[PDB]
Symmetry: D2
Subunit: 455 residues, 4 copies
């Protein structure tokens, strides 16, 4: 049902298990914002799966073989051919992480005033699109915004919404389609191969380019192998390669599915766009031959991307997350369904039904979770959504969630039991969670540095 | 009941998950002898807890700080202060592993014709004693020889047998008392502090020296804290320090409870014996300042010994083994009781009651365990007992067992579930396990290179 | 005269020692462009001192202690305290490398239309200034533009030019003064403490902010200790701390004087500007607590910055470069004088006086240097100067040089002898060096991908 | 003339350069015995080339790939095939270092009362021979004991002395011939291929086995390629393979020419002796599949042995030692000639002509060298020779030397200049070196723990 880890523990990381009362002052010191907690004070850190993964002995062997040359590093050539082989794109430009590649793509493929449409958004991805003069349009299926609706491939793009955008705005006013795999904001929800194929057929007929946000593409490929009909016999690698055959390029954060702690890259097939990308990367990231990464990190990322193609690795990765979700569901704890590839999202609206969204139930549930359990989680609700620029009012998302994000190969099922058991106990007296309000709020990107206080 | 790992995974070790049919071919290639399997073909390797432990990030940081000098290495001084602080002995001599220290002690403290008495024996320990002209005398309590008897501190020395040996032979004819903690041969059974204090009081009255075999002393200290009355307020470190206060010295295999992959040492308080030890260590191991160890390994062992004192680490270590034993016992699988600190012993005589001991049931059970699960275990029965050279007959031990030995910090509860589930499944059709016979048998130490075939 | 290395070799890097005939074929495969050579084909790689340094055993111990948390990593706090202690600034924001910090500073401290003045410029630094709407003004002393003039502290700012800029434009139209230490473009020339104090006094009277480009600040501090009167009793650390006391902030490329292969940061004292920096860093680099760096790399940079303060390290570093310059000068090889802190610049115009600048003498000298020695050097002449886009004409710099850039702690004096001996041998038959012409030329940044053939 | 290092520095080791007065008290604390100095107090540690080598990036990559299994480790298989390929022996048994293999060989191949003859001796090698009942006979050419005689292949066995031993004692009373390459005690002097071939032809005619002490066999192979006629076109590997084709086995210390910090092995071709060796290794070292070594160390040793076959590596290694010898010779400093492969031996008899051998000039010169220069060297004279057991009097060797032993890939020519310059200055007032006498002397192996005082 739930497989054992398809690896052994090679080395362990020291942790501290501090008491509740000490956790209280830290939570107070952090303004009740888990983003402001210190790593050393956290038993199980589920803030994000980005850059928090455990590497393998093979990757660490590569770390000893860093060719740190400014140009022509063997590690770059290794990373280049690995991505060309596994993703199938013609050209690769390394970047220090995913948002470095997003900065490049948005400056290369967007004219001021054009539209960029995709299946929901991510913060840095949407920022670089809008800062380069684009207007974002969400074309995900309406079901993806419904936390409790348990349907497969919730991250699919609504082809009808896409056709509507092309007819009303014109294909020439659409910069590109930004297709994310998986869809982080909807709970790590996958996109079917049929949806990727249908988007490619519709966009190619209008000459509209398609670029993937591929940070969690391997988790996406597992869902296709598990649940999409006709792919149960295909390997993860074959599925990944076919996924990108429907794209003109991609932005990749190795910090997710490449099983590394730093790194990303930009891929594309177009020769002219690749030329302009190499001109722009030297300004922000570095040389086209290292792009803001040490040689050893290009090596670790090349090895890690190949490791992620092992079926047993990715099956266990996803099913460990599912185990935490299943234990929570069995105790009646409200969660986003179905469980995504990288995290379980607690539905703070149902968890904190005594609070309104103006009282920030997700931010307060995350604070309560750490104090009561020593687990750090991330607010993914009204605080992260920001304020509408025209009216200065809160954006009001249907998804008011607390994200329990699982780094790859770091924790065990017993750690998941600690998390689930603590949340299930907290759910018993959920009425005790107090509301929050801003005591400090920045002008932009308030989720990371804002401070709150109770009631 | 069973605690989560008090650490997270820093790095993982690649394994191959070959299916049953391939595991069968590997087992046939190995002549149905788990000792002849290749490490690369094994999912979960429970052959031994010696030298197989996962190190911490701190230990690996120390590995980068190796002072490789031939004399006066900083790593040796670090190791020296740590052992003097934690064990309380005056003098420390490093050795490449435990049997290196036993070679030194046996040559220093034994006159040809003297007696060495202890709570059972280990193979290498008793060999160095007998090769230097000593006759071994078992003075363990009679209960230790009852595999099914579930009683505490089974490893205690019978004080009456000790008093009997002193009266019959004289104190001048007794080289030393060899007190092992824990007792490996009885299943990893602990020794109480009260027994250690009584042995020290009786030997000191007759001027008899006492030297500990302390390879699993930390596991022993946990049993004292858990089960001996009056020690529930003492730290692991306090218990360890008090244990060795009743000894004149010790031999240690760091490859066990020091959480390293290589290393050991010899301790003593006597100045003159320490002087002779420094002369003898240069012949067999190396300088008194490295003793057959790289500098980085003295550092890793010094750091690891201090890590082993953390209560949460050793509690989880012992309870992970107990978890495997409890799950097997709950399904009716016959095991040695009580479960020891480092391993679970399957009673292969009861498990394969349809086979005679001449058909090697423990060897054949270990073979089936690997084929059905990818778990390697060790035969501890008639094969390891060897053949009598004078008569050419099997030595026939009362204990016909398969040893599931758990390396420290390498596996999870899910891995223990893989082991237990496979063994329980085999137990439900145990009548199908076929006997084995020699197709190749060496003249000595047949457990390591013999090959078999089914009957 | 020239000190031995104040360290020993802990580990070595494998190189290939291919003979001249193979090096020729590699050079032809690279189109006679050293930027297109593969690292694996190079014996001594003097392309740059950026990111190519050898780390210490202590830094590598830190690499094993990476706290990879997304927020609140212990490595960030270690880096934070180190910079606050050594540089004296209030606030620190990590970036993946120096140009990442320049991107942040240029967006924070520049209004469109303002002026930025400094002691010459660097490519990435001036680009971020000009892309945010600033006009660059060179206020370096006129002597800095005289390649052959051997005078001290060639990088000082001409206070009269600064006073002239303030009077003509007004202090409100000056974004900040950008003082680089050292000055890379002039050959790595230092700035005196007296010049730093005078700039601070003049700018503070007009309310003009001063930000340092401190990538090679430690090399600069050594020159002050060696050659500025009244500092021979001050430690390197004391000099560094006093240098930054005359600045409101800095951008740093740890890839230079922090003895690492990746990393940088942004410093400032203003609280409000630090708040805006934390909002902007999440868009381009990452969280204020890691800023596009792995935790292990923040640790390595924190350790490396403290190591750079050791007098013996930086003395040997600078004198190793000086050794190469002295040996070349003693044989009559024309070089830029005085020798800078990090590189020796060959005067290719004088070296290949039989060739015109349209025949690319610096590019061709670099080619011959690799073929004859296996040493890679960088063209810093007409090719790197680029082509004017409006007229399609070569930009023609007065400096037509080949840069021998020395990574820190990577090479020995014997390696410098290989470099010098080969160049001196080439100089004895310099008339044989043939000119080059484009067989391929990209539209921009031609230095990195252009290919040539002999004339 | 003297080649540059055929590698780059990947990582550096921190050193301390403490003043003379502090060095004095340490030398006093150590009883004027350099063996008792602390590593942390030494700038350049030339005590020994054993276990002090710098590893490569490839070796350190292997260190991350330790397969720590007790049996069937991939690292053992790597080491096994590498030795079989490069040395040509049938069977390999790993040991923790060379003297572990010597303990095994001496117990396997010696009957009490037999003779073991060889080209001089080493301490641990001769101890295991004599402790197993053999009488040592030196059959090296008489010239090898003359420090100043500069002849090639000084380590050759005198075939006439060998024939004399066979005629007087009988071939049945000769256990084996112990042929060392190189000969450490004579100054690291090589053995010609012709001498190895002649010894094999003479011993095989009498059925006498030949076993090599091969710790520095690669240095030996370089001398053959450099100076023996007909081998200047053969690779180092071909020479090494042919060397061992004249032996029945070997004892190897990886700590020398395998470029590692720990490790050794025993090789042989005989099946029956290999069987007995595997029985004996489990008692002293460990399993035949790891033999007292961590898996990662078997991996590093396998890689290092292959690296030592690179001509440029071993040429530079030997010529760096020769450079130190040439600088000393040019200043008139008396040394053993010719310079050996691994060390320069100062001739303390000529250096301290005002002292008799009873005043221990070599021990006192080593003390003076450290105090005046911060360089540690080893006494190789009357102190190491020991006392004659029959008369209780000093053994009086013709060679009274101070050994400046060079670890592989650790130091530069500039470090050699520091050593040479300091010794040359000390030679100017050599009359100031005071004699020493025992204030403490052990019964055996006095060189390592004895303490002395002046006059
Ligand atoms: C850091 C996170 N996300 C990163 C991310 C990024 C940016 O990648 P970097 O963090 O590697 O810049 C882009 N696209 C998606 C969908 C992402 O989820 C997170 O989910 O916590
Ligand atoms: C190898 C094992 N035991 C080794 C051992 C040793 C030998 O230690 P080394 O393996 O470190 O020599 C000494 N004393 C006891 C009680 C031991 O159990 C084992 O149980 O598999
Ligand atoms: C890459 C080089 N310089 C980079 C540099 C940079 C850019 O730093 P990063 O390369 O760390 O972005 C900034 N400031 C100065 C003065 C620099 O010299 C070089 O000289 O090869
Ligand atoms: C340690 C040294 N010698 C080791 C050695 C050995 C012993 O090797 P281990 O140090 O690896 O035991 C054997 N044979 C020779 C010729 C040796 O030189 C030394 O020369 O300092
Ligand atoms: K990270
Ligand atoms: K680099
Ligand atoms: K060593
Ligand atoms: K091991």
């Amino acid at each position: 049902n739930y497989p054992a880890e398809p690896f052994r523990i090679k080395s362990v990381e020291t942790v501290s298990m501090i008491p509740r009362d000490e956790r209280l002052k830290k939570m107070q010191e952090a303004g009740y914002n888990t983003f402001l907690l210190n790593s050393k004070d956290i038993y199980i850190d589920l803030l994000t799966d980005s850059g928090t993964n455990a590497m393998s002995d093979k990757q660490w062997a590569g770390m000893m073989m860093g060719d740190e040359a400014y140009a022509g590093s063997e590690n770059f050539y290794h990373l280049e051919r690995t991505v060309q082989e596994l993703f199938g794109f013609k050209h690769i430009v390394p970047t220090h992480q995913g948002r470095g590649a997003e900065n490049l793509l948005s400056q290369l493929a967007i004219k001021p005033g054009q539209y960029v449409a995709g299946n929901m958004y991510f913060t840095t991805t949407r920022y670089h699109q809008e800062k380069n003069g684009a207007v974002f349009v969400d074309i995900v299926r309406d079901e993806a915004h419904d936390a409790g609706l348990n349907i497969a491939f919730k991250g699919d793009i609504d082809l009808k919404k896409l056709q509507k955008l092309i007819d009303e705005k014109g294909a020439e006013n659409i910069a590109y389609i930004c297709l994310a795999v998986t869809v982080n904001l909807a709970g790590g929800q996958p996109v079917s191969m049929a949806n990727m194929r249908a988007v490619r057929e519709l966009t190619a007929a209008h000459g509209i380019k398609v670029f993937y946000d591929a940070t969690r593409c391997v988790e996406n490929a597992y869902f296709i192998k598990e649940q999409e009909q006709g792919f149960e016999n295909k390997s993860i690698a074959e599925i990944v390669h076919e996924m990108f055959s429907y794209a003109d390029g991609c932005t990749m954060s190795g910090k997710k599915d490449c099983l590394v702690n730093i790194g990303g890259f930009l891929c594309m097939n177009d020769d002219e766009m690749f030329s302009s990308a190499k001109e722009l990367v030297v300004v922000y990231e570095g040389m086209p031959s290292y792009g803001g990464l040490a040689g050893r990190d290009m090596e670790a990322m090349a090895i890690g991307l190949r490791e992620a193609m092992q079926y047993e690795y990715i099956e266990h990765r996803v099913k460990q997350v599912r185990y935490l979700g299943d234990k929570l569901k069995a105790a009646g704890v409200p969660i986003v369904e179905p469980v995504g590839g990288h995290a379980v999202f607690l539905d703070a609206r149902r968890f904190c039904e005594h609070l309104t969204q103006d009282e920030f139930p997700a931010q307060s549930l995350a604070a309560s979770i750490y104090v009561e359990t020593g687990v750090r989680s991330m607010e993914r609700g009204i605080i992260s959504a920001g304020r509408n620029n025209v009216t200065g009012e809160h954006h009001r998302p249907k998804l008011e969630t607390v994200r329990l994000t699982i780094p790859r190969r770091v924790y065990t099922y017993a750690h998941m039991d600690v998390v689930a058991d603590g949340i299930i106990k907290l759910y018993q007296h959920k009425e005790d969670i107090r509301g929050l309000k801003f005591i400090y709020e920045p002008k932009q990107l308030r989720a990371f540095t804002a401070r709150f206080d109770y009631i």
